[PDB]
Design a protein around this ligand. Structure first.
Ligand SMILES: COc1ccc(S(=O)(=O)NCc2cccc([C@@H](NC(=O)c3cccc4c3-c3ccccc3C4=O)C(=O)O)c2)cc1
Length: 291
């Protein structure tokens, strides 16, 4: 369990960013690591087999704006990024989840189109294949995995921001709606902690949110927990040692550098560190510290 860091990749502040930085909760330190080959905001991060993957996004630059179909792999032992097989389609404002060593890429945008499509990556074959599409087109969608089921929560379908959510059952290659959240959320942070899917922050169409709600998969209900100290949309999120960490985002005024930490036992959020600069639209995941 020891020696794991919270990695933040990419993001946006004035333009899409190439940063890869890693935070050590045990000592409060940040390390700046190898830049992404291509700056990207609106991407997702995940880890399989100790390797960090950066998936999708968009390069917003002064010289153009290009949605990304890329999958890039970072090896902490070498501090190097390597390209992996690209997805079938560019996916900005993507969500990803990992089931049994496979990466699922969910939704996202390409230009004006809002995807319902979903595809699955096999690291052992370096191949992607499409699986069943969601019941709803979703960009800015939160994705998490609990009990080897994939959840897609909230987002924006091209016309409305969504409180709806749905679950993918891999053995049937089928999506089913679940109870909708109490709040419309696009660009929330979605993660799993114990037996619940948490949806933190986001944008409801009017304001960035500090509220946080959790879906208990046994009871099929969404319940609010303590709100974050900051309203935030387009935040990064991960879980580490039984606590939720939220990173950055936008509060309606400022690109946040705040990192907050939720303790489920006390139902409290605390400020734990600040990123080296404020940013939104990051990918986040946890893996071994680099060499
Ligand atoms: C060209 O500039 C960029 C490019 C990329 C990014 S990004 O990579 O962070 N992706 C943004 C995002 C992902 C997911 C969801 C949302 C939701 N929008 C809001 O919260 C929102 C609403 C009104 C004004 C603003 C925002 C907002 C959000 C973040 C930073 C600044 C702002 C505003 O100034 C939603 O549209 O539902 C946005 C950020 C800026």
């Amino acid at each position: 369990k020891v020696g794991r860091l919270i990695y933040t990749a990419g993001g946006y502040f004035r333009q899409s960013l190439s940063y890869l930085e890693a935070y050590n909760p045990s000592n409060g330190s940040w390390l700046r690591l190898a830049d992404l080959q291509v700056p990207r905001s609106g991407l997702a991060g995940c880890v399989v087999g100790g390797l960090l993957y950066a998936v999708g996004g968009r390069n917003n630059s002064p010289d153009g704006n290009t949605d990304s179909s890329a999958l890039d792999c970072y090896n902490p032992m070498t501090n190097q990024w390597s390209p992996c097989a690209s997805m079938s389609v560019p996916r900005n404002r993507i969500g990803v989840g990992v089931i049994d060593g496979h990466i699922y890429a969910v939704g996202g945008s390409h230009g004006c189109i809002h995807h319902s499509s979903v595809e699955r990556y096999e690291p052992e074959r370096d191949e992607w294949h499409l699986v069943a599409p969601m019941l709803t087109r979703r960009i800015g969608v939160g994705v998490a995995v609990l009990n080897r089921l994939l959840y897609a929560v909230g987002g924006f379908d091209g016309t409305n921001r969504l409180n709806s959510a749905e679950c993918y059952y891999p053995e049937r290659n089928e999506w089913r709606m679940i109870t909708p959240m109490n709040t419309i959320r696009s660009g929330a942070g979605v993660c799993v902690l114990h037996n619940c899917i948490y949806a933190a922050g986001g944008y409801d169409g009017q304001d960035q949110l500090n509220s946080v709600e959790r879906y208990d998969v046994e009871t099929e209900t969404w319940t609010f927990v303590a709100p974050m100290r900051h309203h935030r949309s387009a935040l990064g999120i991960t879980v580490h040692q039984g606590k939720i960490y939220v990173l950055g985002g936008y509060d309606g005024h400022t690109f946040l550098d705040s990192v907050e930490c939720y303790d489920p036992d006390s139902d409290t959020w605390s400020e734990v560190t600040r990123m080296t600069s404020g940013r939104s639209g990051v990918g986040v995941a946890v893996t071994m510290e680099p060499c």
